[PDB]
């Protein structure tokens, strides 16, 4: 599974939320729904990763797997598959 860069708007919104520390509402590609906080946007082995923690879980995921993200103060943005 080769990784493709996400659109600039999605990454910019994610970085803004990360440095502003919002309780991000996340939905996975497989459909997993989770309320947690993104601590830092870190890229390892040329594929951009993201660490999201809820009660210290600090689980790692690829940015391609995230389809949409929402918060009360910002609109729900759906990433572009192409």
């Amino acid at each position: 599974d080769t990784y493709q860069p996400i659109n600039c708007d999605d990454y910019d919104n994610l970085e803004l939320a990360c440095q502003h520390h919002l309780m991000l509402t996340l939905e996975l590609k497989d459909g997993e729904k989770l309320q947690a906080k993104a601590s830092d946007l870190v890229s390892r082995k040329n594929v951009e990763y993201l660490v999201v923690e809820a009660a210290g879980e600090t689980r790692e995921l690829r940015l391609d797997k995230i389809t949409s993200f929402s918060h009360p103060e910002i609109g729900t943005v759906v990433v572009s598959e192409s």
Binding site: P5, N7, C8, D9, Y11, D12, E15, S43, N46, S80
Partner: protein, 418 residues
């Protein structure tokens, strides 16, 4: 559509295309505004827009992709890249980025990048792993750039004469000393066309500082490669910005193992602009020249090197003398002993009105054994020994007389042998 082609179309076609899509009274403002309006109208339809540009990173941290058709002039059509994306891909100034753009949202004025799919003519991932320019070890030039076309035309003669006077290799550092009337512009145009013909793989950029608009237009028409220029009516900050954009683009291209050539007209006006913009350090030399100011043009000139790894950066910059201003004389005295190649033009030769007006006895190259072969080097030494006694006007007239019937340099050497 693609933004680059839109920038390449003439103004009347732009007006027709805009009126086709419903824009009104767009024939009476800036071309950049026309492009911005038609791009916004097209993006309102929901189609994707493709665009490219060279990245300039401002002092705040965000960057702007500027186009080279407007000589990197700031305009509404410049693309905006946030600092988050400059952090994502390790982008430096001078990077040529191509990708998709999105229309500005509420509260935004400039178009914003949407997805990067080419960085410096390569993949976004691969261009991240390129070594920086100054980490590369410089070397003496050894790959000769031959200016002789060999078609036997009267335009080739100048190139041939130049090849006999001061050969150029890849990564050279040349200085063309130019009195006012002598045909410096003709020499630059001949060099540019010879580079475009003989060596198409080398990236060629022509930089003009404080040039008249008609000269800029005729150079953009004549030169096959890249021409960016700043007219004399523009402020000094414009000249400085265009020079730094050119040099960073060249450095980024060389980092990818590419030959780059920069023809500069002229280093004197660039130094004057840098003196104007740079604040005084308190130590003002003669002619109003500030010692701190000359530091940056010296960096521009010294960036020319032959990288030990693949690649090279040649810079051939002209310098004006006998201009009646102490500023130019001081700049010449500063820059005199810094060039690998030195080519002198003579006012009194052009007084007789024979071309090219090149001073043979005072023009040469440093470590010219590396560029040329042993036989050609010994032939050049023999010719230099023959030429030396004669005066410059007589030298040029005799050289041109002997260079007429011969078609190539080897035939000329053979004719001189007997």
């Amino acid at each position: 559509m693609n933004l680059t082609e839109l920038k390449n179309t003439p103004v009347s076609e732009l007006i027709t295309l805009g009126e086709n899509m419903g824009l009104e009274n767009l024939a009476r403002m800036r071309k950049q505004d026309i492009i911005f309006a038609i791009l916004k109208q097209h993006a309102k339809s929901g189609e994707d827009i493709f665009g490219d540009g060279v990245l300039e990173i401002l002092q705040d941290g965000f960057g702007f992709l500027r186009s080279a058709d407007s000589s990197y002039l700031a305009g509404p059509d410049d693309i905006y890249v946030s600092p988050s994306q400059i952090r994502r891909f390790n982008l430096r100034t001078g990077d040529t980025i191509s990708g998709k753009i999105r229309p500005p949202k509420e509260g935004e004025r400039y178009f914003a990048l949407l997805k990067v799919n080419e960085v410096n003519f390569d993949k976004p991932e691969n261009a991240r792993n390129k070594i920086l320019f100054e980490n590369l070890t410089p070397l003496h030039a050894n790959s000769r750039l031959r200016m002789e076309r060999g078609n036997g035309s009267t335009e080739d003669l100048t190139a041939r004469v130049l090849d006999l006077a001061s050969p150029i290799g890849r990564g050279q550092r040349g200085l063309i000393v130019a009195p006012p009337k002598a045909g410096k512009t003709m020499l630059l145009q001949n060099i540019a066309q010879s580079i475009a013909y003989n060596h198409p793989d080398c990236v060629l950029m022509v930089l003009l500082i404080d040039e008249r608009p008609e000269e800029v237009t005729e150079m953009q028409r004549l030169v096959k490669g890249e021409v960016v220029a700043s007219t004399f009516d523009e402020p000094a900050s414009r000249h400085v910005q265009v020079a730094e954009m050119v040099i960073e683009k060249a450095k980024r291209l060389v980092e990818h193992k590419k030959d780059v050539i920069i023809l500069l007209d002229s280093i004197t006006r660039l130094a004057r602009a840098y003196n104007t913009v740079v604040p005084a350090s308190g130590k003002v030399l003669t002619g109003g020249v500030d010692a701190n100011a000359l530091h940056r043009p010296k960096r521009f000139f010294g960036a020319a090197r032959n990288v030990e790894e693949g690649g090279s950066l040649t810079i051939i910059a002209t310098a004006l003398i006998d201009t009646g201003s102490k500023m130019d004389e001081v700049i010449y005295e500063e820059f005199k002993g810094t060039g690998n190649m030195e080519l002198h033009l003579s006012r009194k030769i052009a007084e007789k009105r024979v071309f090219p007006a090149i001073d043979y006895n005072r023009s040469g190259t440093r470590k010219e054994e590396l560029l040329t072969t042993q036989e050609e080097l010994q032939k050049m030494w023999i010719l230099r020994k023959i030429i030396h006694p004669m005066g410059e006007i007589d030298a040029m007239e005799f050289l041109i007389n002997k260079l007429a019937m011969t078609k190539t340099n080897d035939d000329f050497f053979e004719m001189m042998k007997r």
